[PDB]
Amino acid sequence: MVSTLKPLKIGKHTIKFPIFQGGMGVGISWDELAGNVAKEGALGVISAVGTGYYKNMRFVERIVAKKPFEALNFYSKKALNEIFANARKICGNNPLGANILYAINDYGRVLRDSCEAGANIIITGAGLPTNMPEFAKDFSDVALIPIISSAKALKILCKRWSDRYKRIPDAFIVEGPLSGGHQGFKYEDCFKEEFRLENLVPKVVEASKEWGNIPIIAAGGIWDRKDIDTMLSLGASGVQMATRFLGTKECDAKVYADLLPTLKKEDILLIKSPVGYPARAINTGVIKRIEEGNAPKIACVSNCVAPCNRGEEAKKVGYCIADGLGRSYLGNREEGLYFTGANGYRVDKIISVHELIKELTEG
Numbered sequence: 001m002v003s004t005l006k007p008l009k010i011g012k013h014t015i016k017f018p019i020f021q022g023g024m025g026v027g028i029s030w031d032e033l034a035g036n037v038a039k040e041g042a043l044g045v046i047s048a049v050g051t052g053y054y055k056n057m058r059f060v061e062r063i064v065a066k067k068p069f070e071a072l073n074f075y076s077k078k079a080l081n082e083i084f085a086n087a088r089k090i091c092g093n094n095p096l097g098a099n100i101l102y103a104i105n106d107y108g109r110v111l112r113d114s115c116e117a118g119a120n121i122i123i124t125g126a127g128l129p130t131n132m133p134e135f136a137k138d139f140s141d142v143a144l145i146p147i148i149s150s151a152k153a154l155k156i157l158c159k160r161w162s163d164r165y166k167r168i169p170d171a172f173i174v175e176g177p178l179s180g181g182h183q184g185f186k187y188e189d190c191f192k193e194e195f196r197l198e199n200l201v202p203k204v205v206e207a208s209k210e211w212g213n214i215p216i217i218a219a220g221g222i223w224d225r226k227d228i229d230t231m232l233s234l235g236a237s238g239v240q241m242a243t244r245f246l247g248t249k250e251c252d253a254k255v256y257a258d259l260l261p262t263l264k265k266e267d268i269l270l271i272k273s274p275v276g277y278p279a280r281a282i283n284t285g286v287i288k289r290i291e292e293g294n295a296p297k298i299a300c301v302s303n304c305v306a307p308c309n310r311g312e313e314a315k316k317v318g319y320c321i322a323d324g325l326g327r328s329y330l331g332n333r334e335e336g337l338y339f340t341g342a343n344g345y346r347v348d349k350i351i352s353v354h355e356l357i358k359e360l361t362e363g
């Protein structure tokens with residue numbers, strides 16, 4: 001209840017604690033997780049990726065081979081609407097974010113869908129999102145947050161946004177190479193000390209100085225209050241954490257509650273991805289199937305990312321990311337694809353979102 005962490009302003013919104021729960025697809029950070037996180041006073045973030053899978057394709061107009069047909073159904077507006085409404089049944093009008101990656105067919109469509117669903121903040125990575133305000137202009141109060149890997153990207157994004165829209169980002173998330181999901185670094189760079197989050201954050205904060213000290217949120221490998229305090233002492237205004245929340249009871253992908261307490265460090269690895277960035281996965285499910293010669297058949301149905309070119313890169317790397325993550329959300333241990341931060345092996349007990357926030361904020 002008593003904390004020395006101070007509330008964080010992002011645009012017109014305020015969160016009690018300077019903590020983001022990072023967005024996680026597919027079906028990992030939806031209404032239960034984000035709702036309870038926001039209820040606790042942190043920023044709950046709803047992933048807008050693969051919402052067609054929500055409640056086993058409850059809100060898709062067409063299904064092929066048990067998959068949402070095309071990007072209009074993979075990124076389902078009605079599903080997103082219901083997820084946000086259900087989250088607000090828990091967290092009321094407490095701020096909620098919507099996370100949507102840049103490298104998609106229909107980026108503006110999904111951003112505006114998130115705004116119309118009630119998002120207070122849009123968070124976008126997996127690319128250089130130089131045009132978020134173009135699609136946000138009808139929603140003046142929604143804060144816009146790019147995820148970056150470098151101070152150079154901060155400078156570029158601010159200059160482009162300022163020149164074109166007379167607006168700059170409301171915050172920046174700098175994500176390091178210990179994070180879950182995809183990495184904003186080449187595989188070889190993920191292991192180099194120059195790109196450790198403790199080295200990225202000071203550079204991004206110094207670059208931020210020139211544009212009015214836009215708040216900086218450090219993400220990737222942050223485990224406990226000590227890591228939070230380190231990042232804050234390096235100039236960050238807040239932190240974004242995901243793996244800790246991946247190990248909470250309120251996680252919307254229930255499989256993780258059984259997978260994480262058994263997870264060993266040697267079973268976490270960086271793999272190739274149809275998205276075109278290294279992805280940090282657990283060596284289980286579809287990965288194992290690929291190595292046995294029983295890889296699921298690949299034929300693009302959901303058209304989930306532009307860099308893949310409708311199955312070309314999926315066939316090259318050996319798996320479809322939409323199919324695998326959807327199967328994971330639907331409970332497929334044999335063929336699901338499972339992601340984790342580097343810290344995933346440190347999850348022993350599955351605890352409540354409430355006790356996690358208490359651990360992170362007490363004192």
Ligand SMILES: Cc1cc2nc3c(=O)[nH]c(=O)nc-3n(C[C@H](O)[C@H](O)[C@H](O)COP(=O)(O)O)c2cc1C
Nearest residue numbers: 022023024025179180181220221241242243339341
């Ligand atoms: C399971 C999992 C799924 C993720 N999916 C996404 C995603 O869809 N979009 C995104 O921007 N980041 C994604 N990430 C990255 C997180 O939002 C977060 O920035 C990162 O994991 C923070 O590091 P930590 O996990 O050590 O706290 C994912 C991370 C994990 C662990």
Ligand SMILES: COc1cccc(C(=O)Nc2nnc(S(=O)(=O)Nc3cccc(C)c3)s2)c1
Nearest residue numbers: 025101125126127147175181182183184277304
């Ligand atoms: C449908 O495709 C899917 C399925 C699951 C997850 C995703 C996804 O978008 N995964 C992510 N993982 N980390 C992300 S990050 O934006 O925080 N870092 C980052 C990473 C790379 C580059 C830059 C600039 C920043 S995005 C997409």
Ligand code: SF4
Nearest residue numbers: 300304308311320321
């Ligand atoms: S084949 Fe490629 S573009 Fe199509 S759903 Fe799979 S990963 Fe996405």
